[PDB]
Design a protein around this nucleic acid. Sequence first.
DNA 1: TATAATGGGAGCTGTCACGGATGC
Lengths: 111, 52
Amino acid sequence: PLLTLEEEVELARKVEEGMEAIKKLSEITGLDPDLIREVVRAKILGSARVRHIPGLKETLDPKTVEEIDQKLKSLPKEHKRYLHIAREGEAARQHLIEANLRLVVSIAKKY
Amino acid sequence: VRAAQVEAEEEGETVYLTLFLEWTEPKDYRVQPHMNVVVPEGARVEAGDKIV
DNA sequence: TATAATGGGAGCTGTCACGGATGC
């Protein structure tokens, strides 16, 4: 279905704040914001999609993403909060794209 | 409004009641579509805490 | 890089002669 202005602004906000969360989380952990992002994304989408990303320096597999996710679960409450923020962000992103998929068709029908 | 503690001074044909009262006064707030609520249902707030 | 814009079109019509697969 199509988003109301409210739903749209909400999803957008959740996405932005999610990215911010990943940044702060990388500051805390000292890990790579990319690796972190791919791990959060992985867990949101599930193990249905797991593949090595060209930009990553490590091969991304359920073993390594479980290691990283476990080290993310070992954070204190205020720090472990940013993880939940990240996950919420990713979910919001997916729902946003899927929501706005119609606009693409309406634009491309003219091409 | 409810009366917690009730004190009474007897004077002449009358009584003067000092009442310790506790009640709640409502204040409405209008939320615009660009705003988001940071507080759950029935949660307690203080001075300085943000509702929206 | 920023008004807002949210489901596509063209089909194309005078052959049987069927073969095996699929359906009340």
